[model samples]
Target: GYGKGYLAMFKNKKVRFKVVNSFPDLKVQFVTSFPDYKVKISNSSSFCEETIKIQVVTSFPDVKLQKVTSFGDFEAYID
Candidate 1:
């Protein structure tokens, strides 16, 4: 079996976020919880006003994470 890891980055006006997994197994599975604000995940790479929401849930086959609202530009990278 193999393992895969992932990371999620987000930014808004006053906040920034970065989520990462130290070690992700091949059959990685996880759940994300964010009960404060409305969340929306997009299929595009760049950020857009219409697609951006107050909150968001993003997951890859090996990782799962969430982001809260912000008011600045935030970015994420993976190794």
Candidate 2:
């Protein structure tokens, strides 16, 4: 399952990241059994690709914007 896999990948990790250029309806919840990190959201129009550019500043992995979705979702991941 996608949720299972996503959760497992961050297990036991102190993830920290920031989201820039996100839309007004953009809302992301960091759900973890052991919450040891903080997620920050910043509004900016400096995105080179689409909605937002996500950067993992700590234990979390990096991701890049490939395309924007109709629902304002962006396709991105560690490159």
Candidate 3:
């Protein structure tokens, strides 16, 4: 209950991500998922309750992103 959540600060929205697999914390070995992506952030504990800056890892023009709905178990969402 004391542990905090992580948020990805996108250009227009903040996608909410919670720990996966009944994690004790969003710290180590913790996984989170967005509509189109799921990543096991390294050293998660070091940066919970913070605004994560996501990059386009590869040199590309862009990609499409879509979330579930207004109310859903969607791990996260953003641009």
Deviation (Å) of 25 in candidate 3: 18
Q: Which residue pairs overlap in candidate 2's backbone?
A: none
State the TM-score for model 1.
Answer: 0.23
Candidate 3 ranges with C-alpha deviation above 4 Å:
1-48, 56-65, 74-79
CA lDDT of each prediction against the hidden true structure? 0.29, 0.30, 0.30
Q: Estimate, for each residue in 19-62, the C-alpha lDDT of model 1 and write its tens digit.
A: 33443222222334532222243334443422212122243443
lDDT of 3 by residue, 28-63 (tens): 222233333233223223323333234332222122
Worst 10-residue stretch by lDDT in candidate 2?
63-72
Candidate 1 yields a Cα-based lDDT of 0.29
lDDT (C-alpha) at residue 49 in model 2: 37
Alpha carbon lDDT of residue 48, candidate 2?
23
For all candidates, the clash counts are 8, 0, 1
Looking at model 3, residue 40 earns an lDDT score of 29
C-alpha TM-scores of all predictions: 0.23, 0.23, 0.20
Candidates, ranked, lDDT: 3, 2, 1
**What TM-score quantifies how close candidate 2 is to the native fold?**
0.23
